Design a protein around this ligand. Structure first.
Ligand SMILES: [Zn+2]
Ligand SMILES: [Zn+2]
Ligand SMILES: [Zn+2]
Lengths: 99, 194, 97, 1008
């Protein structure tokens, strides 16, 4: 939602709809001035939000010789239902393998 | 908070299925781990236009249409459907106005979760309509007299849409899978020698 | 001489001697719960004092040096906040027993 | 010369040593105390008294004509204040007055203030002695020693510095209040004149210590929480009441329209929450008043300042009150812009782009020394004096009697008693609430060392606000680097709240001679006189938290400001702060920052080209080689760790520090090998054991009449050298003797941290001390009330023991006063004794008898006893490393282990003390000193053989193990530090090699 302003008073515009033509139009509240709208959105929020996954430490990896591979529940495109996969938290791993 | 914890042991072996233990470890978490609606959202757009012709109601009670867009990858990651979201939203908004609350949301619409609405996002986001679900309406004030004083009443039910739960028990605060090392270095157990 | 003045088995006084022939170790963490997280975050930031101007190896809170060979001023300051926190912890309160 | 090599490290380290010793030659170590008191006397005393014109409305009556309001409303005003040097106001040729007179006579070393008041009450508004009021007595203010008022400062060295009131160790930053030596402690306050951003209700804040009508803008309050409301900005409480929304205070100040107020704030655009917040602000604004219609339709809502206030701010509550917001700003078209800047700061803090204000970061803190504290106390007692005076002027309505305007109404004893109780009681005025009191201020001055006085004169103190999450208020914060000390602190009730000012630390005083016009010559376009919106993304230049202009390309502008400061064209105590992210420039001309000097890496290096044999510090601040830098300015400077090798590895440095051991305090910087010990041990040594060791006392013991003066016989300096002890050149910073220490098992007497000495060494004078205690009494004047006369006499009728008393009531000057005798004969004429007597444990030879008095004849008596003590079998000692013990066993000489030269140790300690307590610095110190004091063989030819000798155990720059062990190889001894001994009983070879070598030990007070 970008703010819009009046061309006579340069105050903030107030959206206001009369159902004579089924049309939205921005109106000013200062003098009397009105004009026709262009956009659609009356309000926009983008509310907010603009590891705690379980780890093991006793399994072989592919690249690094570590025990860790974090496992979370997934349902992949070639998988089925509940599946587990193992990629090490080391960035040397980079590889996702099935059991 | 010490009066609320419960430890759960799970020992049903089968002996040789090879990671049936860790599959047992996590599905019982999946039945209990709480996920909500307010976490997977991105934005929230009410808009008088784009559904003027979709407003087919003979007296024109329908003007405002609040989108609540999701993010696709988290809805596709944890295997969360879209129609069960409709199920869990509709029955909750029914079963809480059946509760003695108000008569403010009796005429809730809760239309459909579509995963592709339209080429939206006038104010700059520039995405291509990826889970824009729950495209509701709020015609409670039939023949809406004032546009701005009705938009605020479409912002007293957006919170109760955000605060609902999708997959998991509503009573559970958390659930954690930890401690692959039962030796004597850890806390008090009932059994572990084996 | 060092076999005969120290009890070999005890964990209490076998790391004290590595703090003066070996290295100290982990002097800073956010789990030593008396100084707040802000002190940790700007002590991590203060590693611009010739530690980012020259290096990025090692880490803040890790001292690679020992008491016998001496501490250059950053890890001396980190050791000072650690010893200060132990003084504050073992000094305050104690009326609960 | 651009390489900066070829004038390398022996030149640069020599220059750093010369610069540091010239620093202490110019400033000393009590510089800040003296500067703040001197500034108060020179400027702030006259600055306090300019208050008002003293109107008087005299409301008593109106029934009748002869008691109408027909007697004249008076007028009187203050002029100049004149402060004398302190004199002893006796009749028949008054005398000059000294601090030793004040100590020995139990009076206050104070000076008289005289004010040039003018009064011109004159009957012309009924329906003069401006002259003859030049010198009016107004209180008596105490005087700091070595001030611009003390009489011990006009002569430099050998005219008459020898007066009768001196020591060669005293530098005098103290007071004398009724016989006692008082000393202020530096307080710590928040830096006002700065915007402060909270986050629990999001309430960005414009503080002002003066002008107690000043406001905050708060965005995280919605007034309700039913379903939810949008966060809207309310300009909350403004005149200690009267909340207003933000837009009424926009259109009261004459904003033309919207979309310029959005450009006055000028946030990012997008970030919906911000624009939702401001449209909710407008929608809240028009709900309480129809604004922006006339010049009075919006300004008329500013109405709560009239009746709904509870406290109407003066008379004419209108646009006259618009000089209660932002007095440093001059017209409304800048005040509107500064309100927009405040709101932009709040919005930028909400989105996580500007971090909130951390209180314990010392760039947000101003330290109040003696000047500001005397400001505060004198304002309190002067306001009480003004009220007490104007109530006294009103009692003479319509009949004069005693009308002489002065010396009948203005009582000096009010301010006198006030300033006396402030020092004597500790009831110090709180800096905020003008009715309560605070306590953690002026204390006593220790005298046991000459180092305890130095430590006691350099301290700063955080108060206790409330114990609910004080946060990091007792932990070293990275802004302490170079200014306060991060090793030494007290422990206990105030661990980490009292901090020690470092060696090279300095405190700014004030900058007069205003510098707004001085900034135009490098950039600094001036601020406009209309909203409009011509303001680009140009940087902002604030002056003490005040818009005075706007510049662009600030990377050149602050470079030119620093170049004008280094050429001695801008004042030296001015910080230049370039914030590149927030697009902002701050300039500080403030009273109470913390400054320290640094080497500027010049591109020409005049030291190569000129080379004189002298460098005054005023001279090195003119060529810009050194530079006084605050805390704000330093974080924009990448500083190396010394010329040693570190300014030679690169050229990415813009400054250099003189040496790294100047980071520490006055008492921690002289400890050998001080970065090798555990931090707890260095805290012990540098806070308690250095302050207690027996050593030097004074260089005129005939005048110090105090309880328990103590002193050694043969004090010494250590064998090693540190940087700070060499630049300071005070051998009174070391109080102990160079004992020889061998680590070995004795027969079981040195267990559990106990030590074993040598009786032969004790009999040649080693550690032999000498104490002097003083006994005091008093009686009235001579005969007056202004029988109970307890006049000092003998009373020959044999009350107690009178073998040594004379006829006057006091003993003679060679007596041998015993376990329990009569020490002062304070007996009356016929009644029983009131005489002072010794208790069970005091005795000794009489040293002197001092008999002084007071103004009202209050005769004072002083008797000092002397004793000589050798250290007994219960006394306590310690090393330089927090390694203390008790002397448990004194051993005869021929039983110690002896080397092939026949050397015997003086102190033997247990080897179970070292692997646990983690002090290898004591072993390294012993090896270093043993390598110093030994001779050096193979001296014939090829060298003078005594020039590659290390004597420097500077703390953060210390010799390596290979240096020490190769020195011990050169001196002839074994490389491992050990030494072969033979036993003193069996006489044959002890199998285990013994570690020996000298160490500086200390002897502590509270003997037993
Ligand atoms: Zn208009
Ligand atoms: Zn791998
Ligand atoms: Zn949508």
């Amino acid at each position: 939602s970008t703010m819009k302003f009046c061309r006579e008073c340069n105050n903030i515009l107030y959206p206001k709809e009369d159902r004579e033509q089924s049309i939205l139009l921005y109106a000013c509240r200062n003098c009397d001035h009105q004009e026709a709208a262009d956009d659609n959105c009356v309000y926009r929020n983008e509310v907010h939000h603009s590891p705690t996954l379980p780890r093991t430490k006793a399994v072989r990896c592919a690249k690094c010789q570590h025990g860790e591979a974090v496992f979370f529940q997934a349902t992949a495109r070639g998988e089925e239902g509940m599946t587990l996969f193992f990629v090490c938290c080391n960035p040397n791993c980079g590889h996702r393998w099935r059991e | 908070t010490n009066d609320r914890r419960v430890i759960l042991y799970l020992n049903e072996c089968r002996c040789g299925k090879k990671y049936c233990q860790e599959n047992s470890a996590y599905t019982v978490r999946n039945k209990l781990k709480k996920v909500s609606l307010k976490d997977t959202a991105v934005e929230f757009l009410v808009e008088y236009r784009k559904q003027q012709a979709i407003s087919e109601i003979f007296g024109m009670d329908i003007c405002l249409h609040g989108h609540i867009h999701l993010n696709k990858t988290l809805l596709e990651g944890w295997n969360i459907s879209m129609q069960d979201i409709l199920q869990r939203c509709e029955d909750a908004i029914n079963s809480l106005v059946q509760k003695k609350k108000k008569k403010a949301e009796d005429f809730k619409k809760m239309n459909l979760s579509v995963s592709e609405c339209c080429s939206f996002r006038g104010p700059g986001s520039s995405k291509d309509s990826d889970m824009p679900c729950l495209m509701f309406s709020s015609y409670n004030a039939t023949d809406p007299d004032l546009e701005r004083t009705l938009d605020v009443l479409c912002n007293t039910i957006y919170p109760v849409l955000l605060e609902t739960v999708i997959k998991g028990d509503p009573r559970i605060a958390s659930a954690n899978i930890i401690w692959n090392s039962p030796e004597t270095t850890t806390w008090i157990r009932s059994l572990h020698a084996s | 001489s060092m076999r005969n003045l120290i009890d070999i088995k005890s964990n209490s006084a076998i790391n004290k001697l590595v703090q003066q022939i070996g290295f100290l170790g982990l002097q800073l963490s956010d789990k030593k719960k008396l100084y707040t997280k802000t002190l940790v975050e700007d002590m991590a930031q203060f590693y611009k004092k010739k530690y980012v101007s020259t290096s990025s190896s090692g880490d803040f809170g890790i001292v690679k040096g020992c008491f016998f060979h001496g501490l250059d001023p950053y890890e001396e300051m980190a050791h000072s906040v650690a010893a200060r926190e132990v003084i504050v912890r073992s000094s305050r309160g104690l009326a609960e027993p | 010369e651009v390489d900066l090599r070829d004038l390398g490290e022996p030149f640069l380290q020599s220059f750093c040593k010369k610069a540091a010793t010239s620093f202490f030659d110019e400033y000393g170590l009590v510089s800040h105390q003296l500067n703040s008191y001197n500034f108060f006397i020179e400027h702030g005393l006259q600055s306090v008294f300019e208050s008002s014109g003293e109107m008087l409305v005299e409301p008593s009556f109106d029934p009748t004509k002869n008691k109408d309001h027909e007697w004249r409303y008076a007028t009187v005003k203050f002029g100049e204040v004149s402060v004398d040097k302190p004199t002893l106001y006796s009749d028949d040729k008054e005398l000059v007055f000294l601090p030793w007179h004040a100590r020995l006579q139990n009076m206050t070393y104070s000076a008289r203030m005289k004010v040039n008041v003018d009064v011109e009450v004159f009957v012309k508004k009924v329906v003069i002695l401006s002259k003859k009021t030049q010198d009016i007595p107004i209180g008596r203010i105490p005087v700091m020693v070595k001030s611009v008022l003390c009489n011990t400062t006009e002569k430099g060295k050998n005219g008459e510095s020898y007066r009768k009131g001196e020591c060669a160790f005293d530098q005098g930053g103290y007071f004398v209040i009724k016989g006692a030596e008082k000393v202020f402690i530096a307080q710590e306050q928040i830096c006002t004149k700065r915007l402060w951003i909270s986050n629990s209700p999001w309430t960005v804040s414009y503080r002002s210590e003066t002008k107690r009508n000043r406001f905050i803008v708060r965005l995280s309050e919605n007034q309700k929480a039913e379903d939810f409301k949008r966060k809207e900005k309310v300009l909350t409480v403004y005149f200690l009441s009267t909340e207003i929304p933000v837009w009424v205070l926009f259109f009261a100040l004459g904003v033309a329209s919207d979309k310029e107020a959005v450009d006055l704030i000028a946030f990012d655009g997008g970030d919906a929450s911000i624009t939702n917040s401001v449209v909710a602000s407008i929608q809240e604004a028009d709900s309480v008043c129809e604004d922006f219609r006339h010049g009075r339709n919006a300004l008329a809502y500013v109405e709560q300042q009239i009746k709904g206030t509870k406290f109407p701010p003066g008379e004419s509550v209108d646009e006259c009150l618009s000089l209660y917001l932002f007095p440093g700003l001059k017209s409304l078209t800048q005040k509107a812009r500064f309100l927009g800047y405040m709101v932009k700061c709040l919005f930028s803090a909400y989105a996580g782009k500007r971090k909130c204000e951390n209180r314990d970061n010392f760039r947000n803190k101003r330290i109040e020394l003696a000047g500001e504290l005397l400001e505060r106390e004198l304002r309190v007692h002067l306001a009480h004096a003004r009220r007490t005076m104007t109530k006294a002027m009103q009692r003479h309505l319509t009949g004069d009697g005693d009308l002489k305007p002065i010396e009948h109404y203005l009582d000096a004893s009010i301010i006198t008693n006030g300033l006396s109780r402030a020092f004597s009681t500790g009831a110090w005025c709180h800096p905020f609430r003008k009715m309560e009191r605070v306590s953690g201020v002026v204390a006593n001055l220790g005298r046991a060392n000459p180092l305890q006085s130095l430590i006691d004169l350099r301290r700063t103190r955080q108060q206790v606000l409330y114990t609910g999450r004080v946060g990091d208020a007792r932990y070293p914060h990275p802004s302490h680097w170079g200014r306060l000390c991060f090793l030494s602190t007290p422990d206990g009730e105030n661990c980490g709240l009292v901090k020690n000012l470092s060696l090279l630390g300095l405190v700014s005083t004030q900058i007069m001679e205003p510098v707004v016009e001085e900034l135009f010559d490098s950039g600094m376009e001036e601020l406009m006189d209309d909203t409009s919106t011509p303001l680009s993304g140009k940087h902002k230049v604030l002056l003490n938290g005040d818009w005075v202009g706007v510049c662009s390309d600030s990377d050149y502008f602050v470079a030119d400001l620093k170049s004008r400061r280094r050429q001695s064209e801008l004042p030296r105590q001015m910080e230049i702060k370039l914030d590149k992210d927030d697009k902002e420039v701050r300039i500080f001309t403030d009273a109470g920052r913390l400054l320290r000097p640094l080497l500027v890496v010049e591109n020409l290096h005049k030291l190569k080209q000129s080379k004189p044999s002298k460098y005054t510090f005023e001279h090195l601040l003119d060529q810009g080689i050194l530079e006084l830098i605050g805390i704000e300015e330093e974080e924009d400077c990448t500083t190396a760790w010394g010329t040693k090798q570190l300014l030679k590895q690169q050229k990415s440095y813009t400054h250099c520090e003189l040496d790294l051991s100047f980071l520490l305090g006055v008492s921690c910087a002289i400890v050998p090998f001080a970065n090798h010990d555990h931090g707890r041990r260095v805290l012990y040594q540098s806070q308690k054991h250095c302050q207690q060791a027996i050593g030097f006392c004074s260089t005129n013991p005939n005048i110090r009449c105090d309880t328990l003066s103590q002193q050694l016989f043969y004090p010494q300096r250590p064998l090693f050298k540190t940087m700070a002890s060499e630049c300071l050149q005070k051998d009174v910073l070391f109080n102990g003797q160079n004992a020889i220490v061998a680590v070995n098992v004795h027969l079981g007497f040195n267990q559990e941290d106990s030590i074993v000495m040598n009786k032969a060494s004790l009999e040649r004078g080693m550690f032999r001390s000498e104490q002097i205690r003083s006994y005091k009494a008093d009686v009235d004047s001579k005969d007056s009330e202004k029988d109970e006369v307890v006049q000092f006499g003998k009373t020959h009728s044999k009350i107690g023991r009178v073998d040594s008393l004379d006829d006057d009531g006091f003993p003679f000057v060679g007596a041998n006063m015993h376990s329990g005798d009569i020490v002062i004969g304070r007996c009356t004429e016929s009644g029983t004794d009131h005489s002072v007597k010794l208790k069970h444990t005091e005795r000794g030879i009489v040293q002197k008898v001092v008999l002084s008095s007071n103004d009202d004849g209050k005769n004072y008596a002083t008797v000092s006893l002397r004793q000589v003590r050798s250290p007994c079998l219960g006394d306590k000692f310690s090393s330089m490393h927090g390694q203390k013990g008790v002397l448990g066993y004194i051993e005869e000489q021929e039983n110690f282990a002896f080397t092939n030269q026949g050397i015997v140790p003086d102190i033997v300690i247990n080897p179970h003390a070292f692997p646990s307590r983690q002090t290898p610095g004591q072993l390294l110190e012993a090896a270093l000193s043993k390598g110093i004091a030994c001779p050096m063989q193979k001296k014939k030819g090829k060298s003078d053989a005594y020039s590659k000798v290390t004597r420097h155990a500077t703390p953060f720059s210390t010799p390596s193990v290979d240096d020490i062990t190769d020195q011990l190889h050169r001196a002839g001894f074994s490389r491992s530090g050990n030494e072969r001994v033979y036993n003193g009983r069996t006489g044959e070879m002890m199998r285990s090699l013994i570690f020996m070598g000298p160490n500086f030990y200390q002897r502590l007070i509270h003997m037993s």
